């Protein structure tokens, strides 16, 4: 087309609000105050192509997983209305997170004001994905113990809301605060250690280990840590500047970790419901 023509630009000619990662030397979309140009660029090759498509495809995938889960036979669950509500909250959190992410990455180059609005939605979505993922997990883990289940839901929701509020602060979106962002969101996911200790103290090592909670929880903690480390450190583009502009830079790998992380988490809580089904609702 001969409408809204553009060429990628080197990192040095970018305005300030577009200078996120100076290890990405070329292939940047120039500032373009057109939503038409921004959404057309999804089919173009630039520094944001992989970021858009990993969470655009991840978003539809979780939306198909969420719809299909909603229509599963009611016989398969001990309490289908309640169980579908808890999973529904997880799917909702995953879909809002992935949707805000792919939209923000698409309209990032629009203007300073649009970029500022969508970066706050992008950050807020991570917290929503984390808050939502605790709901089915605390539900099956504290199935017979209602007082800790209720308390830990207040805590993850209160910590999540504080992360959403901190995400509104304009300093938080600056490149200097990259490590602060990794720390805030990592802390939020790692705060799951508190209800995990409570579960292990209440039920013991054999129970925590027999049910695959322990193996699955270690993997989740691993995905969080390596995912946060890649993001904070800008690995591997730090080691090959100008060689990862389009493919496999840190943000792109991190996006992959979020989708994988959300699927492994779904798999873990899905096994907990199958186990709760085998033993029934008896306490």
């Amino acid at each position, epitope marked *: 087309e*001969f*409408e*809204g*023509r*553009w*060429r*990628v*630009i*080197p990192h040095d*000619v970018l*305005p300030d609000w577009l200078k996120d990662n100076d290890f990405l030397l070329h292939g940047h*979309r*120039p*500032p*373009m*105050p*057109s939503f*038409r*140009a921004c959404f057309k660029s999804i089919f173009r090759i630039h520094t944001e192509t992989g970021n858009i498509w990993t969470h655009l495809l991840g978003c539809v995938f979780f939306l198909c997983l969420g719809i299909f889960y909603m229509f599963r036979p009611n016989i398969s669950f001990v309490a289908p209305l309640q169980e579908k509500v808890v999973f529904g909250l997880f799917f909702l959190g995953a879909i809002l997170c992935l949707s805000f992410s792919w939209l923000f990455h698409t309209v990032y180059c629009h*203007s300073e004001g649009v970029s500022r609005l969508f970066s706050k939605l992008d950050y807020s979505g991570i917290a929503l994905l984390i808050m939502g993922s605790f709901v089915p997990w605390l539900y099956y883990s504290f199935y017979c113990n209602p007082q800790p289940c209720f308390i830990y839901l207040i805590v993850i929701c209160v910590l999540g809301i504080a992360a959403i509020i901190v995400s509104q602060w304009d300093m938080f979106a600056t490149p200097q605060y990259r490590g602060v962002r990794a720390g805030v969101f990592l802390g939020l996911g790692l705060s799951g250690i508190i209800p995990t200790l409570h579960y292990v103290i209440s039920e013991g090592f054999l129970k925590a280990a027999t049910i695959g909670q322990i193996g699955w929880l270690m993997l989740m903690a691993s995905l969080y840590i390596t995912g946060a480390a890649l993001y904070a450190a800008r690995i591997p583009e730090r080691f090959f500047p100008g060689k990862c502009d389009i493919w496999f830079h840190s943000h792109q790998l991190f996006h992959i970790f979020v989708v994988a992380g959300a699927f492994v988490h779904f798999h873990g809580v899905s096994n907990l419901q199958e186990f709760r089904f085998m033993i029934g609702g008896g306490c």
Partner: single-chain antibody
Amino acid sequence: EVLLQQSGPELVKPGASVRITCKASGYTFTDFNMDWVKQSPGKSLEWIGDFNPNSGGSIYNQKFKDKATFTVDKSSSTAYMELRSLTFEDTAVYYCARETGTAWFAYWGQGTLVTVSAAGGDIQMTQSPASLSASVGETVTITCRASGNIHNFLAWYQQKQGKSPQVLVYNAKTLADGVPSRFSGSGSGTQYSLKINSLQPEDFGSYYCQQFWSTPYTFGGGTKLEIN
């Protein structure tokens, strides 16, 4: 540090051909597209076309498809423009202007004057007002109307007499580097404005708007501003 240095003036006879040089420095030559602009004496700016030094591809305004030919010399970071079968209508100042991703022009050459003498043997941009005179300290507003939606792909330029234009505002509201805060751009769709708060003696000159949404790129007729 970015400079675009053009070849000297040319006095040629009808039917001849001229090649204008544009030597680019202070950046990686292939990284940005180069555009060519014509300005007839006492007239508005006209877009000739654009050239991509990397791909070697060019897009011409249909009006000049048979008049201009763009070439490059990647080694010497130079763009060329051949003008053929010259007539009296071709008497003008020709500029090379550099893009930065989208076709708003942050960098311009000094211009090459081509004089044709025999002595020796599409989006319309409507600018308003066409001219105005105001005192120092006052506020002025120049408007720009486009015949079609240009999706905020608009730039404002100031041109002093005998000089090349210089960008003030791009992407409808983005103040260009080094430009005073007195200048502000606004608008959306088809309607745009350039506001000059607290007029200064250096603010006299011609003002032009430019759309870079659709090819061929076009300029408004200009607003001549005089300071009392």
